[PDB]
Every structure is written in C-alpha cells, then in structure tokens.
C-alpha cells in the first residue's frame with residue numbers, strides 16, 4: 001500500500017497561446033512523507049520461500 | 054506544518070514567466086520538489 | 096434428376112461495403128501550377144474517357160444518409176488543408192499588445208468601428224532588434240484587453256498564415272473505386288436520397304465535385320433535372336436538416352469594393368507577415384446581391400415542394416437564423432481568397448398562405464482569422480487580397496431547419512442552417528454508393544467432375 005497523504009492543489013499558468021503549465025499551487029494541511037507499507041509476516045514468509053529455492 | 058523527515062524536500066519558488074502576450078511577463082510562484090531543482094550559485 | 100454443384104468465378108454479385116476510394120483531377124489543375132492542395136497531395140490524372148456502364152434490369156437500394164463516401168471526403172479535405180498549412184508561417188510573434196485607434200478616413204456609417212488602425216512592436220530578422228509597425232485589423236479579429244487590444248486567438252492558439260502561393264479554390268474532384276469495389280450511380284430524376292432506384296449505372300469515378308465550403312447556401316453545385324428536390328433523413332423530425340436542391344440556379348454577386356494594399360512585415364529569418372497597409376479611397380460595406388424576382392420564384396417552388404410533406408393549406412414562414420456563432424448565423428464563404436460572412440435575413444423573410452430589378456442586397460463582413468471545420472485551436476490567418484474583389488456564384492441549393500412547431504400543425508417556419516460540411520458533400524454524393532464484389536458463385540448443373 002503506497003500513499004501520498006499531502007493534499008495537493010493543481011494551478012494552471014498560461015505560458016503561451018494555448019500553452020498551460022500545471023504546477024503545485026499549495027498544500028492543504030500538514031506535510032507528511034509519502035510512504036509504502038507491506039506486512040512483515042508475509043514478506044518474511046516470501047523471503048523464506050525464496051531462500052529455500 | 055512539515056515533519057522533520059520532510060524538511061527541505063519542498064521548495065517555494067517564485068519566477069517570471071511568459072504570458073499569452075509576447076510582450077508581457079507575469080510573476081508567479083510554485084512548489085518544486087528538492088530533487089527537481091539545483092542551486093545555481095536562494 | 097442428378098444435379099451437381101458447379102463453381103463460377105467472376106459472377107456479377109455485390110454487397111454494401113465501405114472502403115478507401117482514391118481521387119482524380121483533370122490535367123488543367125496541373126497546368127495552373129498554383130499548387131492546389133488536392134492536385135498536389137492526393138489526386139492523380141483523370142481518365143480522358145471515363146467508363147459508365149448502364150445496368151439493365153437492376154434495381155438497387157440507396158441511402159444518402161448512411162454513405163461512408165461523405166465521411167471519407169470530409170476527412171480527406173480536412174487532412175489536405177492541414178497538410179498544406181504545415182509548411183506555412185506560424186504567427187506566434189503576432190500575439191502582442193496592440194495600440195488601436197479608429198479608421199475614420201472616409202468611411203460610411205454602416206462601416207463605423209469595423210476597421211481598426213493598430214500599432215505594435217514586432218520582431219525583426221535580428222533577434223535583438225524590434226520594429227514599430229502598424230496595420231489595419233477587422234473589428235472581429237481583435238478584442239480589448241482592458242486603446243489596447245489583442246488578437247482574438249491569442250488565448251486559444253497561434254494562427255498559421257495561409258501561404259499566398261497555395262490555392263484553396265475548389266477544383267473538381269472525382270472519387271474512384273479500387274480493385275474489388277464498384278461505384279453505383281442512381282440516375283432517377285426524382286430520387287429523394289433514400290429508397291429504390293430503377294435506373295442504375297456503374298461508374299469508375301464520380302462526376303467532378305467541387306468542394307465548396309459554404310453555409311446556409313450551396314454554391315456552384317449540381318442542379319436537379321426536373322423539379323426542386325427536398326431531402327431529409329426524416330422530414331417529420333425537426334431536428335434533421337433539410338437539403339434543398341434547385342432545378343434552376345440563382346445568381347449571387349458578392350463584392351468587397353474597398354481598394355486594399357498588402358504590406359509585408361519581416362518578423363523573422365524568411366518569415367513574412369502580410370498585413371493590410373492602407374485603404375485607397377472611401378471605405379464601403381462589402382455586400383452581396385441577388386435578384387428579388389428570381390429568389391421569390393425559387394422560394395415559391397421550394398414552398399410548393401414542401402407542401403407535399405407539410406400540407407396544402409399550412410402556412411409556411413421563412414425566417415432568418417435563430418442563433419449561434421458567425422459561421423452558422425451567416426452565409427459564410429470564400430470570395431477571391433477573402434472570407435465573407437453575409438447577413439441572410441433579407442433572403443428568408445417571407446410568408447406563404449397557399450392562395451423589377453430590386454436586387455436584394457445582403458450586407459457582409461470580412462474576417463482574416465478563420466476557424467474551419469468547427470474546430471478549436473487550429474485557427475488560420477488569411478492574408479489580405481490586393482485590389483477590389485468581385486465574385487459571381489450560383490446558389491443551387493439550401494440547408495434548412497424546421498422549428499418544433501408545438502404540434503399545432505397550423506404553421507411551419509423554416510430557417511437557414513448549416514455548419515456541418517457533411518451536408519454540403521451529401522448534396523453532391525446523394526446519388527452514389529460503394530459496393531464490394533463477391534465473384535464466387537455456386538449453382539446446380541448436370542456437369543460432374545471426372546474421377
């Protein structure tokens with residue numbers, strides 16, 4: 001399970017005729033590190049099987 | 054309101070940019086990830 | 096008796112099908128050397144003596160509203176225009192602030208505020224130098240930013256200037272079928288676009304079709320042979336457009352009387368922008384003219400043909416367009432390279448109840464920034480044409496729309512319509528269909544193979 005918890009806002013900036021650049025406008029709330037999570041037991045079992053092979 | 058692990062990861066960068074009119078410039082700002090920018094020499 | 100299967104290869108059998116036709120043009124275009132898009136990118140020489148074979152005993156079902164020929168022609172013309180515009184100049188630097196004043200030097204009251212004298216700074220062949228230049232812009236091609244103006248397209252896309260060496264004038268185009276396919280043609284005089292045809296032929300190529308781009312009025316097209324023809328996918332559905340084909344043409348004379356000067360401005364290395372320099376003489380409204388009596392007779396014939404579907408006693412109203420943008424609300428066309436949009440309110444302003452050179456005059460406006468095919472983001476800039484412009488064309492048909500009517504059934508009102516060019520192509524391809532040959536047949540005989 002991977003997540004970016006920061007609530008991000010997309011801002012359009014017109015840089016030319018019909019040319020728009022989509023930037024990060026603001027962060028709503030606190031800023032936290034995006035992270036992934038995996039079960040320890042499942043990963044340990046999978047690694048054990050890999051080692052056995 | 055950042056955490057200690059996310060310190061310096063995001064940067065608030067202001068710059069002048071072109072507009073739909075070739076003779077006009079707009080001062081804008083954005084947020085850039087630390088990995089996407091490099092110091093030239095603030 | 097004893098009968099056995101027998102195989103025949105090359106039997107005259109066919110099925111309805113879709114394929115990719117090719118296009119042919121006469122050698123005359125190759126002799127112009129004006130680089131017509133069709134003759135340059137798509138088409139090949141036309142056969143001096145095209146083959147038409149009349150199919151005796153054959154009765155074939157036609158439907159002009161489900162003909163892939165129209166879709167292929169629409170795609171082809173759009174692609175060819177884009178291809179011709181690819182190598183042309185892109186007017187990105189033209190998107191700058193404009194300081195615009197009026198042009199009041201001998202103008203008429205009707206043309207007040209239509210033209211603007213705009214000064215601006217522009218790039219030169221040297222990247223580090225700027226030149227202060229001026230031009231004349233039509234009121235429709237500019238919009239006020241806040242005396243400060245900008246081109247209408249600057250917030251959508253950059254316009255591509257039409258190369259003056261390229262010609263978009265409509266030359267006849269023939270559509271021809273490849274191997275394994277045939278083009279069937281209905282020669283019935285009173286064919287309404289759908290149903291059986293008893294006088295059928297097969298043709299290598301279609302007749303010369305001129306891809307004329309116009310709205311509210313079909314120009315320089317084919318005429319009906321006996322009477323005015325009304326065609327609609329479903330006449331009782333007011334949401335379906337009605338294509339009207341005339342049996343006699345109506346002459347229309349359109350003119351821009353203003354004597355215009357073309358000025359070249361060097362905006363980059365090898366990049367030239369063609370602007371309107373000055374107007375020589377007085378400024379008058381461009382206009383079109385049609386004979387009142389001829390138009391009245393044509394409208395009477397159209398009403399007579401419509402009463403066959405909407406009643407002998409129903410009152411018929413011809414009113415102007417309801418709403419939309421300039422292309423749909425006006426008769427739009429190209430005259431000598433300039434893009435005209437004419438007010439047709441004087442043409443559809445009539446009442447019919449079922450019971451001399453006044454020369455109806457239609458005021459017209461001109462545009463230089465053109466959005467074709469109802470697209471967005473691919474605007475095109477038309478450079479001005481030097482001198483005085485006059486063109487004469489034939490109205491051969493109409494595109495109409497019927498109002499809901501509220502189901503009262505007492506009256507019916509018709510308004511000019513258009514926009515979708517597919518109807519324009521249908522006005523010419525209604526009599527053609529494409530079929531795929533099935534050359535294998537199996538039949539019983541007394542012939543038995545040897546053992």
Ligand SMILES: *[C@@H]1O[C@H](CO)[C@@H](O[C@@H]2O[C@H](CO)[C@@H](O[C@@H]3O[C@H](CO[C@H]4O[C@H](CO)[C@@H](O)[C@H](O)[C@@H]4O)[C@@H](O)[C@H](O[C@H]4O[C@H](CO)[C@@H](O)[C@H](O)[C@@H]4O[C@H]4O[C@H](CO)[C@@H](O)[C@H](O)[C@@H]4O)[C@@H]3O)[C@H](O)[C@H]2NC(C)=O)[C@H](O)[C@H]1NC(C)=O
Nearest residue numbers: 129262264265307314315428429430431432486487488489
């Ligand atoms: C429905 O159908 C009708 C008839 O088919 C059609 O009207 C025709 O329109 C075309 C184009 O608008 C007309 O062709 C133009 O005619 C003008 C007038 O010149 C007359 O006199 C000369 C004298 O020799 C004749 O050769 C000529 O045939 C005319 O009788 C010409 O000046 C045009 O040529 C110039 O423009 C061409 C296109 O740009 C160039 O290829 C050509 O070399 C000429 O260049 C001139 O203009 C350039 C700028 O464009 C400039 O740079 C050059 O230096 C030069 O000044 C062109 O041949 C034709 O005459 C009309 N026919 C009739 C009977 O009216 C309708 O337009 C059509 N309706 C629709 C909606 O399509």
Ligand SMILES: *[C@@H]1O[C@H](CO)[C@@H](O[C@@H]2O[C@H](CO)[C@@H](O[C@@H]3O[C@H](CO[C@H]4O[C@H](CO)[C@@H](O)[C@H](O)[C@@H]4O)[C@@H](O)[C@H](O[C@H]4O[C@H](CO)[C@@H](O)[C@H](O)[C@@H]4O)[C@@H]3O)[C@H](O)[C@H]2NC(C)=O)[C@H](O)[C@H]1NC(C)=O
Nearest residue numbers: 024025026027028054063064065066067080081082083084
């Ligand atoms: C990245 O960097 C940019 C630029 O540095 C930051 O953008 C600035 O954000 C601040 C804070 O939001 C802005 O300052 C605030 O603007 C509010 C909006 O008011 C506008 O209109 C008034 C009236 O005309 C102007 O005076 C004002 O300048 C603004 O144009 C003001 O309401 C704020 O003041 C009031 O409210 C605060 C909060 O309640 C009070 O403390 C004050 O006393 C006062 O009552 C304040 O001035 C600033 O204008 C923004 N600049 C730009 C260029 O947009 C981003 O926030 C930053 N992002 C991150 C994530 O760091």
Ligand SMILES: *[C@@H]1O[C@H](CO)[C@@H](O[C@@H]2O[C@H](CO)[C@@H](O[C@@H]3O[C@H](CO[C@H]4O[C@H](CO)[C@@H](O)[C@H](O)[C@@H]4O)[C@@H](O)[C@H](O[C@H]4O[C@H](CO)[C@@H](O)[C@H](O)[C@@H]4O)[C@@H]3O)[C@H](O)[C@H]2NC(C)=O)[C@H](O)[C@H]1NC(C)=O
Nearest residue numbers: 196197198199200212213214227228229230231372373374
């Ligand atoms: C759209 O807008 C542009 C710019 O505003 C207009 O261009 C201007 O047109 C006016 C009128 O033609 C120009 O002014 C006239 O210029 C004539 C040319 O002389 C040139 O050389 C002399 C000598 O070096 C310079 O002094 C002068 O500035 C020019 O560079 C002059 O001869 C005119 O004055 C003389 O003649 C008139 C008429 O006979 C007399 O009344 C005077 O008293 C004097 O004897 C006059 O100065 C102007 O220079 C143009 N500007 C530019 C930038 O080109 C367009 O005309 C306008 N178009 C429309 C349709 O509105």
Ligand SMILES: *[C@@H]1O[C@H](CO)[C@@H](O[C@@H]2O[C@H](CO)[C@@H](O[C@@H]3O[C@H](CO[C@H]4O[C@H](CO)[C@@H](O)[C@H](O)[C@@H]4O)[C@@H](O)[C@H](O[C@H]4O[C@H](CO)[C@@H](O)[C@H](O)[C@@H]4O)[C@@H]3O)[C@H](O)[C@H]2NC(C)=O)[C@H](O)[C@H]1NC(C)=O
Nearest residue numbers: 289327328329330331332333334335499500501502503504
């Ligand atoms: C060419 O164009 C015409 C005009 O659009 C079409 O004629 C329409 O055909 C539709 C479909 O048959 C008609 O709608 C149906 O009408 C039936 C008759 O009811 C009449 O009276 C009621 C009174 O309340 C009106 O509401 C109704 O509009 C009719 O005037 C109804 O019984 C139908 O209802 C059933 O079907 C609908 C649609 O599936 C369901 O939603 C209902 O719940 C119900 O099961 C239906 O409303 C329409 O009235 C016709 N209009 C006219 C002007 O005649 C042609 O069909 C078309 N031809 C082709 C080949 O496409």
Ligand SMILES: *[C@@H]1O[C@H](CO)[C@@H](O[C@@H]2O[C@H](CO)[C@@H](O[C@@H]3O[C@H](CO)[C@@H](O)[C@H](O)[C@@H]3O)[C@H](O)[C@H]2NC(C)=O)[C@H](O)[C@H]1NC(C)=O
Nearest residue numbers: 065066067068069070071077078079080081082083093095
């Ligand atoms: C966007 O563009 C503007 C205009 O080019 C930039 O502002 C300009 O910044 C320069 C450098 O800071 C200023 O010149 C300096 O001025 C100071 C006095 O404040 C002087 O001591 C220095 O010697 C130098 O001359 C200039 O005046 C200023 N112009 C303005 C504000 O109109 C702006 O910095 C640009 N933005 C970004 C994000 O780069």
Ligand SMILES: *[C@@H]1O[C@H](CO)[C@@H](O[C@@H]2O[C@H](CO)[C@@H](O[C@@H]3O[C@H](CO)[C@@H](O)[C@H](O)[C@@H]3O)[C@H](O)[C@H]2NC(C)=O)[C@H](O)[C@H]1NC(C)=O
Nearest residue numbers: 076191192193194195213214215216217225226227228229
């Ligand atoms: C083409 O570019 C030139 C140069 O950029 C433009 O001229 C410049 O116009 C600005 C705005 O009018 C001038 O600045 C202003 O000057 C006045 C005094 O006249 C002052 O009161 C204002 O506060 C402001 O500073 C600038 O001086 C001027 N530069 C010149 C003439 O060299 C010109 O307007 C541009 N043309 C078009 C059609 O946009």
Ligand SMILES: *[C@@H]1O[C@H](CO)[C@@H](O[C@@H]2O[C@H](CO)[C@@H](O[C@@H]3O[C@H](CO)[C@@H](O)[C@H](O)[C@@H]3O)[C@H](O)[C@H]2NC(C)=O)[C@H](O)[C@H]1NC(C)=O
Nearest residue numbers: 413414415438439440441442443444445446455456457458
């Ligand atoms: C559509 O058709 C109607 C009816 O023909 C046009 O309205 C009519 O226009 C004529 C000519 O302008 C009017 O006659 C004028 O009457 C005034 C006042 O009596 C008189 O001073 C003039 O000398 C001229 O005789 C007529 O009254 C008027 N009728 C109505 C009911 O409005 C209408 O202009 C047409 N629309 C278009 C776009 O052609």
Ligand SMILES: *[C@@H]1O[C@H](CO)[C@@H](O[C@@H]2O[C@H](CO)[C@@H](O)[C@H](O)[C@H]2NC(C)=O)[C@H](O)[C@H]1NC(C)=O
Nearest residue numbers: 004005006007008009010025026027028029030
């Ligand atoms: C991310 O931020 C946006 C904007 O602040 C949030 O959108 C708001 O959602 C609430 C309901 O949760 C509404 O009442 C507000 O009107 C919304 N504001 C807008 C759309 O401007 C969004 O909910 C936030 N997402 C998370 C996961 O926190």
Ligand SMILES: *[C@@H]1O[C@H](CO)[C@@H](O[C@@H]2O[C@H](CO)[C@@H](O)[C@H](O)[C@H]2NC(C)=O)[C@H](O)[C@H]1NC(C)=O
Nearest residue numbers: 001002003035036037038039040041042043044
């Ligand atoms: C990854 O996310 C899923 C949900 O998308 C988590 O599944 C939930 O697990 C908890 C605890 O076992 C249950 O109570 C929920 O009913 C589950 N929801 C589901 C399956 O939709 C899963 O545990 C997460 N894995 C992690 C965080 O490692």
Ligand SMILES: *[C@@H]1O[C@H](CO)[C@@H](O[C@@H]2O[C@H](CO)[C@@H](O)[C@H](O)[C@H]2NC(C)=O)[C@H](O)[C@H]1NC(C)=O
Nearest residue numbers: 055057058059060061062063064065087092095
């Ligand atoms: C702005 O961000 C930069 C980059 O993270 C900060 O530079 C670091 O600051 C910390 C805290 O003082 C020092 O320990 C580091 O040595 C600095 N350099 C690096 C590469 O991390 C800077 O301090 C920040 N300034 C402010 C005012 O927030």
Ligand SMILES: *[C@@H]1O[C@H](CO)[C@@H](O[C@@H]2O[C@H](CO)[C@@H](O)[C@H](O)[C@H]2NC(C)=O)[C@H](O)[C@H]1NC(C)=O
Nearest residue numbers: 195196197198199206207208209210211234242
């Ligand atoms: C310059 O042109 C504009 C656009 O036509 C004029 O603006 C109009 O002027 C008339 C006459 O005074 C007014 O009745 C209108 O209300 C104005 N606006 C519009 C949208 O038409 C302007 O007057 C012209 N100025 C000069 C000096 O010629």
Ligand SMILES: *[C@@H]1O[C@H](CO)[C@@H](O[C@@H]2O[C@H](CO)[C@@H](O)[C@H](O)[C@H]2NC(C)=O)[C@H](O)[C@H]1NC(C)=O
Nearest residue numbers: 314315316318343344345346347487488489490
């Ligand atoms: C507009 O229609 C008229 C009348 O049909 C055309 O003039 C005729 O053109 C044919 C061409 O073969 C000549 O044979 C006739 O002699 C011409 N006159 C008449 C009275 O028929 C005219 O060419 C058409 N114009 C366009 C642009 O198609």
Ligand SMILES: *[C@@H]1O[C@H](CO)[C@@H](O[C@@H]2O[C@H](CO)[C@@H](O)[C@H](O)[C@H]2NC(C)=O)[C@H](O)[C@H]1NC(C)=O
Nearest residue numbers: 286287288289290291325326327328329330404
């Ligand atoms: C074109 O003509 C065909 C017949 O040649 C019309 O189709 C018939 O329409 C009537 C109703 O008006 C039906 O009762 C018949 O069953 C239809 N027969 C066939 C073979 O289609 C068609 O409606 C006409 N289209 C028009 C006038 O737009």
Ligand SMILES: *[C@@H]1O[C@H](CO)[C@@H](O[C@@H]2O[C@H](CO)[C@@H](O)[C@H](O)[C@H]2NC(C)=O)[C@H](O)[C@H]1NC(C)=O
Nearest residue numbers: 352353354355356373374375376481482483484
């Ligand atoms: C449009 O304007 C140009 C330029 O003023 C006119 O060209 C002139 O034509 C006359 C003959 O009519 C010549 O004597 C001049 O030498 C020409 N001047 C040039 C070419 O600069 C042209 O005649 C005008 N056209 C109309 C229809 O009025």
Ligand SMILES: *[C@@H]1O[C@H](CO)[C@@H](O[C@@H]2O[C@H](CO)[C@@H](O)[C@H](O)[C@H]2NC(C)=O)[C@H](O)[C@H]1NC(C)=O
Nearest residue numbers: 346347348349383384385386387452454455487
């Ligand atoms: C459209 O223009 C043509 C000429 O290009 C006009 O035809 C002329 O008509 C007048 C009056 O009937 C005749 O005297 C001329 O001999 C005709 N010239 C031709 C046919 O070359 C036609 O009348 C115009 N139609 C309008 C203005 O509605």
Ligand SMILES: *[C@@H]1O[C@H](CO)[C@@H](O[C@@H]2O[C@H](CO)[C@@H](O)[C@H](O)[C@H]2NC(C)=O)[C@H](O)[C@H]1NC(C)=O
Nearest residue numbers: 415421424425437438439440441444456457458
């Ligand atoms: C086309 O011409 C007609 C009549 O010549 C114009 O009709 C006028 O439209 C205005 C604007 O809606 C109405 O207030 C008037 O009632 C109409 N006057 C007449 C004479 O009927 C019409 O405006 C023109 N079309 C456009 C869009 O300019």
